[PDB]
């Protein structure tokens, strides 16, 4: 047992300095706005374009679009015209007798430009954590329909992370089917999800639209470009840094019954060019694994107090919300929460790893795990080998460049370290 002053105490990870990091998800998350219709009792999925037009008719404040925050590295008139083009093509759909299953758009110069026919460091913005927190919360809707599996499902079904799973399975499946069927065409794809309301009725939700570019996906790695056009009530001027990749239009005036009364708030459209791949789409389609996986994680945490007290305390832990796990960290103190919070926190982590999947995250995960093990052994006073901490910190920190989710994960590790080796 070597002398104290020789023992190595893992230092915090160094996060790069830079302009604040920017949104890089395939679709909006907390800033999303749904325009929704209540499905009939019989229900029966209608045609996406029909539903989309129906959903848009539930809003009554549409106005002439204008640019309120430009894409610095873009031709912003093309984004405005792209939106007007989408409305014109929806008008054309409306005028035909039958609604078609798919709509191929005119390949105008604005769409060809936008469909296209980063190693600079960034500092961690607070929006990333704020996102994670929103994913952890409960919505008033349930996004999943129907062991310890049942109690787990009660908790996550109304969870915002679960909305994101269903949103992402829908969009990626639409996008993939369009990619196979219409490789040359610029297809207009409604972004739709379905949920069940507190009252029990089924609801269809329009978040906006995606225009698919050319999609000759010979390989897994081959990329398809797309323009995303997404409603939101978020004013881009609150956090401009978040929206660096976007052109933002003002498209409408929305009425909200606020805490003072009826306010008019502007509705916006967040527009950007983005890309995806056969393999990335297929992974988006697999996002329901995120429920199986976080389920496995929770069942394993309930297989610790099941081989400690010689009797599974599932009905206990779930039925009694007096048992708590450490979940957050106010500088006030370590926030604790019911098994529900834990289920949702873990889901949100699994989901966010899917949504923000990247090479940086692959590196960070493989390396930070090994340091994590060392930190746990140090905390248990076990004297692990620290001889390779130099190589390990290097392997981790070369993954800390600009990816917002990796940066957040690094920042989380640093907090854990402080508390672990206090």
């Amino acid at each position: 047992s070597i002398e104290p002053f020789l023992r190595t105490t893992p230092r915090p990870l160094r996060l790069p300095d830079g302009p604040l990091c920017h949104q890089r998800s395939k679709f909006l998350l907390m800033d999303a706005l749904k325009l929704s219709i209540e499905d009939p009792s019989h229900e029966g999925e209608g045609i996406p374009l029909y539903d989309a037009i129906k959903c848009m008719k539930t809003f009554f404040g549409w106005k002439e679009p204008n640019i309120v925050k430009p894409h610095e590295k873009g031709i912003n008139p093309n984004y405005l015209m792209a939106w007007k083009q989408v409305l014109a093509e929806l008008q054309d759909i409306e005028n035909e007798e039958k609604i078609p299953r798919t709509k191929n758009m005119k390949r105008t110069s604005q769409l060809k430009w936008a469909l296209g026919e980063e190693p600079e460091p960034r500092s961690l913005a607070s929006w990333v954590q704020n996102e994670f927190n929103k994913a952890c919360e409960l919505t008033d809707s349930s996004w999943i329909e129907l062991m310890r599996r049942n109690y787990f499902t009660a908790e996550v079904s109304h969870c915002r992370a679960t909305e994101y799973i269903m949103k992402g399975v829908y969009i990626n499946t639409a996008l993939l089917n369009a990619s196979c069927a219409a490789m040359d065409d610029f297809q207009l794809i409604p972004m739709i999800s379905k949920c069940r309301t507190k009252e029990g009725r089924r609801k269809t939700n329009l978040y906006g639209f995606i225009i698919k570019g050319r999609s000759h996906l010979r390989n897994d790695t081959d990329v398809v470009n797309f323009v995303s056009m997404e409603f939101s009530l978020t004013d881009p001027r609150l956090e401009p840094h978040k929206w660096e990749k976007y052109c933002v239009l003002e498209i409408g005036d929305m009425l909200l019954r606020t805490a003072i009364g009826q306010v008019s708030r502007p509705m916006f459209l967040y527009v950007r060019t983005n890309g995806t791949s056969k393999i990335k789409m297929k992974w988006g389609m697999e996002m329901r694994r995120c429920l199986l996986q976080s389920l496995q994680q929770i069942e394993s945490m309930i297989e610790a107090e099941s081989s400690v007290k010689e009797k599974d305390m599932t009905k206990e832990f779930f039925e009694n919300k007096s048992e708590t796990w450490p979940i957050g960290e106010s500088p006030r103190g370590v926030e604790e929460g019911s098994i529900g919070k834990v289920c949702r926190t873990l889901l949100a982590k699994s989901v966010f790893n899917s949504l923000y999947a990247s090479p940086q995250l692959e590196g960070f995960s493989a390396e930070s795990r090994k340091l994590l093990l060392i930190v746990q052994a140090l905390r248990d006073n076990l004297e692990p080998g620290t001889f390779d901490l130099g190589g390990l910190y290097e392997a981790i920190e070369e993954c800390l460049i600009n990816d917002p989710w990796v940066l957040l994960n690094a920042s989380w590790f640093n907090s854990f370290l402080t508390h672990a080796l206090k």
Binding site: Q129, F132, N133, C136, M301, W325, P326, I327, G328, E329, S330, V334, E335, K341, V342, T345, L346, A348, K349, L372, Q376, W412, F413, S415, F416, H419, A420
Partner: peptide, 10 residues
Amino acid sequence: DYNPYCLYCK
């Protein structure tokens, strides 16, 4: 501010 790592400190 939720941090999944605090679950390691049960």
